[PDB]
Amino acid sequence: GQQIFSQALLNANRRGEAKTALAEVQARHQELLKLEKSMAELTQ
């Protein structure tokens, strides 16, 4: 005669996955902005 609930922990691997690939997409975006700027000068 008894019952029980249950809780959950996230995976360690995940860690700060919010920025694991955010930093990387931000870095690529910076590269793309540099590309865009250089192309703007070249077109001019």
């Binding site: 690529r28 590269e31 793309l32 540099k34 590309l35 250089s38 192309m39 000068e41 070249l42």
Partner: peptide, 19 residues
């Protein structure tokens, strides 16, 4: 690496066009 190569080519072409 492909994007860095593209950037390098664009910078070179900017130099040639300035010339």
């Amino acid at each position: 690496s492909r994007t860095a190569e593209l950037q390098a080519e664009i910078d070179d072409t900017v130099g040639i066009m300035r010339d």
